[PDB]
Amino acid sequence: PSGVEGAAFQSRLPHDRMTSQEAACFPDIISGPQQTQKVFLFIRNRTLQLWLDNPKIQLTFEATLQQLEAPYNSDTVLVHRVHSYLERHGLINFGIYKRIKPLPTKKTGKVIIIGSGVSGLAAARQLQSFGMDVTLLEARDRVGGRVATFRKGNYVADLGAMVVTGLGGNPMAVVSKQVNMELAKIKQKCPLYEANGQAVPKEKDEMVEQEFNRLLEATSYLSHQLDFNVLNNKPVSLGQALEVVIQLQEKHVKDEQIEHWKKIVKTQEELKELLNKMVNLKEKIKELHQQYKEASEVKPPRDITAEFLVKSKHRDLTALCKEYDELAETQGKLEEKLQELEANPPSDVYLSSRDRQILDWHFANLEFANATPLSTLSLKHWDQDDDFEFTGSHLTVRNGYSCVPVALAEGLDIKLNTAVRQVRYTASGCEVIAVNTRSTSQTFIYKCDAVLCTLPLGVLKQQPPAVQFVPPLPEWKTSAVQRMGFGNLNKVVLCFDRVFWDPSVNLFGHVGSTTASRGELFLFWNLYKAPILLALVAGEAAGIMENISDDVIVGRCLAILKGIFGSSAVPQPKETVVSRWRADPWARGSYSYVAAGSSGNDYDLMAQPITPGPSIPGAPQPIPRLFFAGEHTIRNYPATVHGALLSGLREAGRIADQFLGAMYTL
Amino acid sequence: RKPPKGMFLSQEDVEAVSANATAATTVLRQLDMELVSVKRQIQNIKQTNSALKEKLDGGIEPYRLPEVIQKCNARWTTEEQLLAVQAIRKYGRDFQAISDVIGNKSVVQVKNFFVNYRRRFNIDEVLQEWEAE
Ligand SMILES: [C]C1=C([C])[C]=C2C(=[C]1)N([C][C]([O])[C]([O])[C]([O])[C]OP([O])(=O)OP([O])(=O)O[C][C]1O[C](N3[C]=NC4=C3N=[C]N=C4[N])[C]([O])[C]1[O])C1=NC(=O)[N]C(=O)C1=N2C(=O)[C][C]C1=[C][C]=C([N]C(=O)[C]([C]C2=[C][C]=[C][C]=[C]2)[N]C(=O)O[C]C2=[C][C]=[C][C]=[C]2)[C]=[C]1
Numbered sequence: 001p002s003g004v005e006g007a008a009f010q011s012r013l014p015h016d017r018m019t020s021q022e023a024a025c026f027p028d029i030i031s032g033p034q035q036t037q038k039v040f041l042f043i044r045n046r047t048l049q050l051w052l053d054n055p056k057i058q059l060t061f062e063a064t065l066q067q068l069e070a071p072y073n074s075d076t077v078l079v080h081r082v083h084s085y086l087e088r089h090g091l092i093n094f095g096i097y098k099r100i101k102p103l104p105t106k107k108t109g110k111v112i113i114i115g116s117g118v119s120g121l122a123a124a125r126q127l128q129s130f131g132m133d134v135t136l137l138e139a140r141d142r143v144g145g146r147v148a149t150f151r152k153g154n155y156v157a158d159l160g161a162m163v164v165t166g167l168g169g170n171p172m173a174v175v176s177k178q179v180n181m182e183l184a185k186i187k188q189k190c191p192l193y194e195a196n197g198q199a200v201p202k203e204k205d206e207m208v209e210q211e212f213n214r215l216l217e218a219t220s221y222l223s224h225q226l227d228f229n230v231l232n233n234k235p236v237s238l239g240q241a242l243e244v245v246i247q248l249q250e251k252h253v254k255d256e257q258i259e260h261w262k263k264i265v266k267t268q269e270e271l272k273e274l275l276n277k278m279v280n281l282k283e284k285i286k287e288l289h290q291q292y293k294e295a296s297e298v299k300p301p302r303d304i305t306a307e308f309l310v311k312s313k314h315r316d317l318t319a320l321c322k323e324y325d326e327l328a329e330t331q332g333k334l335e336e337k338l339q340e341l342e343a344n345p346p347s348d349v350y351l352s353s354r355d356r357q358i359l360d361w362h363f364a365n366l367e368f369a370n371a372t373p374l375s376t377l378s379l380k381h382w383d384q385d386d387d388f389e390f391t392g393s394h395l396t397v398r399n400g401y402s403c404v405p406v407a408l409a410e411g412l413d414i415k416l417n418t419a420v421r422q423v424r425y426t427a428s429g430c431e432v433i434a435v436n437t438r439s440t441s442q443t444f445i446y447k448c449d450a451v452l453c454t455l456p457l458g459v460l461k462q463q464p465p466a467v468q469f470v471p472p473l474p475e476w477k478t479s480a481v482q483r484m485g486f487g488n489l490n491k492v493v494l495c496f497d498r499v500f501w502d503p504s505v506n507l508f509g510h511v512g513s514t515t516a517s518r519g520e521l522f523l524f525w526n527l528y529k530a531p532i533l534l535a536l537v538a539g540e541a542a543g544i545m546e547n548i549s550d551d552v553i554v555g556r557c558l559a560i561l562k563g564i565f566g567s568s569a570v571p572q573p574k575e576t577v578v579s580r581w582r583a584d585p586w587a588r589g590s591y592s593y594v595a596a597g598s599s600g601n602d603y604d605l606m607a608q609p610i611t612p613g614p615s616i617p618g619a620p621q622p623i624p625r626l627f628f629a630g631e632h633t634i635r636n637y638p639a640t641v642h643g644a645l646l647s648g649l650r651e652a653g654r655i656a657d658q659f660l661g662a663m664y665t666l
Numbered sequence: 667r668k669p670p671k672g673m674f675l676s677q678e679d680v681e682a683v684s685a686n687a688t689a690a691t692t693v694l695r696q697l698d699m700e701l702v703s704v705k706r707q708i709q710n711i712k713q714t715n716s717a718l719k720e721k722l723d724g725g726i727e728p729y730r731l732p733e734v735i736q737k738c739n740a741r742w743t744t745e746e747q748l749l750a751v752q753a754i755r756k757y758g759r760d761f762q763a764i765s766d767v768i769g770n771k772s773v774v775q776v777k778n779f780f781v782n783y784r785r786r787f788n789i790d791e792v793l794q795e796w797e798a799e
Contacts, residue, residue, distance in 0.1 A: 217670045225667075226677055231684060245675070247683050247690055252674040254697040261704050268711045275718040282726055289729040304748045308767075311749060312756060315766045317731060324726055 007048035010169050011091055012388075015045060025085050025665050043072055043082045051092035055174045058097045059083075084664040088656060090126055090649030094171075096178040096407060099129075107133045109659040112432050112446050114420050115454040115586075117145035119629040119644035121408035123452055126652030128412065130660060135446065136412060137434050139419040139586045142402075143409045146456070146587060146631075147641065149402030150493055150577050154530045156400045157493045159579045161641045162527075162534075168391025171649075172642045179407045182398035184527070192361060192509045197563035200358060200511070208355055212362040218245045223379050235596040238382050239375030242363075249350050256346040264341050271334045274327060281324045288317055361511045364518040367539035371487025371590045371639070378596040385600070388636045396527050401641070418444065423451055424470040425625040427615040449659060450625055452651055454644075457486045457606075457632040458588025466585070473610065480605035484632065485595030487639075488582040490542045492521070492557060494533040495575035500565055501526055501533065510560050517541055521560055533561075546580045553578055591639035592632040603635035607647070609654070623658065627651050739770045742779070746771070750779060751787050758796040 001009040008015035018037060022044075023030045029040050050067060051059045061083045065073055073079065086092045110133040113124050120136055121143065127134045142148075148160040164183060167173040176183060192200040219241040222228040228244070229236055292313040298306055351359060363374060370377055397403065417437040424431045430451045436442040459466055460481050472478075501508070501524075509523045519539025526533060535557060537545050545553065554576050562570045581590045594600070610626035629647040637643030669675045683690050742750075746768050753764040761776045768776070780789060 214670050214673055218673045218675065221669045221673075221675060222680070225669075226675070226680060228680060243690075244680065244683060245673070247694065248675055248679055249673065251679070251683070251694060251697070254694070254701065258697060258701055258704065261701070261708060265704060265708055265711065268708065268715065272711055272715050272718070275715055275722070279718055279721050282722060285726050285729050292731075304745065305752065307745075308749055308752045311767050311769065312753070314731060314734075315763055317729075318766075319763070321726060321730055328725070 004042065004045040004049050007052050008045045010052060010173070011048050012169050013044075013048075016041065021089070022085070025662075026081070039072060039075075040078065040082065043068070043079060044086065046072070047083055047086055047092060051086075052174070055095065055177055056097060058093050058100045060100050063100075081664050081666075088130075088662070088664065089653040090122075093129070094122070094126060094649055095175050096410075103128075104131045107131050109133065109450070110448040111135075111450045111452060111655060111659075112137065112430070112448040113452045113454065114423075114432070115139070115145060115456075115630075116143045116405070116409065116414055117454045117456075117630060117644060118147055118405055118408070118641055119631065119633075119648040120145070120452075120454040121405055121412070122645045122648030123454070123629055123652040123655075124412050124648075125408060126649055127655065130652070130656045132656070132659070134413060135448075136414045137418045137420055137432070137446070138414060138416050139437055141416045141437070143414065144402050144405035146581075146591070147401045147405050148579075149400030151400060151402075152495075152575060155493075155495045155532055155575055156528055156530065157491075157495075157532050157534055157577070158397065158401050159491050159493065159577065161401050162396055162525075164395040164397070165640070165642075166390035166392035166394055170390045170392075170642050171645055175404065175645070179404060180399075181401075181403055183395040184398045185393045185395055187504075187506050188394075189505060190507045190509055190523075191505070192358065192511055193564050194354070194357070194511045195513045197560075204355070204358065208351075208358040209362060211351070211355075212359055215242060215245055215249075215359075219379065229380050236379040237375050237596045238377040238379050239373065241379045242374060246350070253347055253350045260341070260346050264338070267334060267338060267341070271331070271338070274331060274334070278324065278327050278331065281320065281327065285317070285320050285324065288313065288320065292317055357513070358511055360515055360518040361509055361522060364512070364522040364539055365509075367519055368489060368523070368536055370593045371489040371538070371542075372485060372593045372595075373540050376485060376593070376595055378594045378598060381594045381599050384594060385636055385638055390642075398528065404641075415444075420455075420467055422468045422470060423453070423626065425451060425610065426612050427619070427622045430625050450627060450655055452627045452629060452655065454628075454630045454648075456587050456589070456630065457481065457484060457592050458582075459586065460632075461486060462588060471612070477605065477608070477610070480602045483595065483598045484602050484606070485593040485598065486589040486632070487591060487593045488542045488546075489590040490537040490545060490579045490581060492535040492537065492553060492579075493575075493577040494535065494554070494557065494573050496531040496533070496571060496573055498571065499531045500569045500571075508564075510564070520545065521557060524561075543582060546583050550576065550578045593639065600635045603633060603638060607633040607635075607650070627655060734769065736770050738772050738775070747783070747787075750776075751789075751792065754789065754792050755796055758793065 001015070005015035013019060018026070018030050018041065022040075026040065029036055046068065047059070047064050050064060061080055064083050065076060065079050068079065083092075108131060111127055113120050113127075113134060113136040116124075116136045116138040120138075124134050124136050138145075144160070146160045148158065150157045150159055163186070164170065164172055164176075167176075192205060194200055219238060222241055222245065223236075228241065231240070292310070295306070295309045295313060298310075300307075302310075367374060370382065415434075418434045419437050419440075420432055420434045422433040424433070430448055432446040432448070432451060434444045434446065436444075455467060473481075503526070505526060507523060507525050510521060512518045512520055512522060519537060519541030521535050521537060522539075522541075523536045524533050525535070554573065558570055558573075562568075581587045607628055609624040609628065611624040612622060612626075614620070614622065629644070629651040631639050631644045631647070634643045634647040634650070637646055683693060686692075749768050750764065750771075753767045757763045757767075761773050761780075765771050765773045765776045771779075783789065
């Protein structure tokens, strides 16, 4: 899309319909007359457009109304209502802009933000921009959290997020104009290489892949059409579903072979009967010729009965030769209608051991995508976010994604090396107790009106708790923490003094020997300006590799690589790094997934803020005090940077509405 | 609507590979045997048939009789009439065979005969006697 409707789309909104969100702030308009809705929609779209066309400077109500025409710039309470909702909810003036009206004088309310993740930062910025008093508390000694970037000399590699999944309606697209990130595209071309170290022929490469995709839809069919969703009380995983399909595929392979030879027999046995009938005819015929011979020897002149005998047997014989000729006829047809059946057996196997191995790499890719064993993903929901796809080619950050959280960080009150330990929230405020990560006896107390919690889900799951809630989180919330999945995925950074891979190629896969190790070093990335190869560890493997030393790992790594490129095209690496996210105490994993027995709905639960009980009982129902953001909290953009970033914008909006009031819902 | 084409998935099939923990490898193993079992029987009847083809060796070639190209005729020689009357006793109503035996009469000349001489060859009696066998 382009024009004004471009903006609506590039902002994740229907250009010609009002959202549930908007309904709530403009209930006057939407219950209103069709004509007004259209005016509204345009104003929105148009403002968005303006912001979008230039997101390096703040966009004021003046500057906005300024660029409008009648009939539109007629009503200005509308324009204000609109520009103001858009501002609040971070559709316009989010990220890094230049403020036209340097920040209003004294600040209102105070919020503690746990963790300077992207979700953390993006919210902090928003709040501060709304003139609130914001402090972030970070356990690590750097910002970004799961946006980690390795830097040393000229080597630059992300150990955390690394891919931008397309600019089409991606908030990061704005951010990218605001910050210098070199975005390189990802040539989707990816050659595979079996265990031996030999490329896989385009002939196979394509068979397997296509079968993979076929297998996927298959599961989708079992799910939605056959309703195969529970199974002796447990929910079905993608994993099960896949097996159950593969099995059925193998089954039908046999089913065919059976009824194919089962046809050969039924025919071979027709041939049998006919041959028997044929022998027993040569039998009569043999000994009936005898009789004609004997009766033909009686030399004439013969009387008439003896003449009749000759004449008669001679018919009776040519009669039986007719018969047997018609049978050797029939015989011939069947004998060839049998080289026919032996010529085209149906298929011998469903997949060879080499096939079913490559198919495994395709599953590894899927385990990588979801940071988890397919045995754990929900069948029904594993891909519930499947509509909200961005458009455009996927990209990478050529200069390390960290360039972003660092840029967001700028101008904010951040306490690094500060491990939150207890969150206490009550009717009249909250206090947060952190310690110093370096010397942990050294304690801190933070008082504030609201707490925004951007703790990773992994952290939130810890048993026993790394952070204590006072009072405890309601059971509706803590079940949503159990139920949800929090996966794992690990990277290996290989730094060299020379390129020795195909420079024209961004990614290439390695095919493991067993199902069990399909994830182990299954895929490599050539991404950066320096000679750095980056290798993945996904699936069941990632968890196990965390227990293995770095040398051993880089070992198995170089192996595989020599295996493909020749045992002396591959030098020792100058510099290596190995992530361990499930180990890392401020992550406890990589990003969330939709575990079997969860649904997208749990994500909505994660986002529901907490409202304490009353102080003096029988006093009025309080304000909500404890708020949540982070990749695990955004039903429609789970597990991503843009997703977090968005969840931050969300909560900031929600908190401002709460503590600064909403002048725009009038 | 329909499973991707070339994938096979029956409602009924599914419940069958799930019934227990290894109804999976069970059902896949019946067929593995159900096969080698058909496949063995194929070689039995391959050999059984092969030995029968052994007997039919050389066909019926030495037993075939030369061609009788002889033209149909009006006259019933007394020879032909007797040949006829005996054919009837042996063949009943198979006017084709009867015609074939007398050599040179049309399949109808025969039926005609059946009504003309019916009289004096007691073809009634004759015919009911062919039945009595
Ligand atoms: C780990 C990781 C790695 C290694 C990598 C990656 C990742 C991860 N990811 C994720 C991210 O990173 C996340 O999410 C974020 O970052 C988060 O944020 P937040 O929320 O904020 O959180 P944090 O950061 O953590 O923060 C926190 C804080 O806090 C703190 N603490 C703790 N504790 C404490 C504290 N403080 C105080 N106290 C206490 N106590 C800490 O420290 C911190 O700071 C990612 N993402 C992205 O975006 N990208 C990337 O690249 C990444 N990475 C990778 O590699 C991969 C992953 C992924 C996934 C996914 C995606 N996408 C998607 O999904 C979409 C979907 C769809 C589909 C269809 C349709 C529609 C939609 N798209 C697509 O396309 O798909 C497919 C695919 C898959 C895969 C791949 C490719 C493609 C992306 C990515």
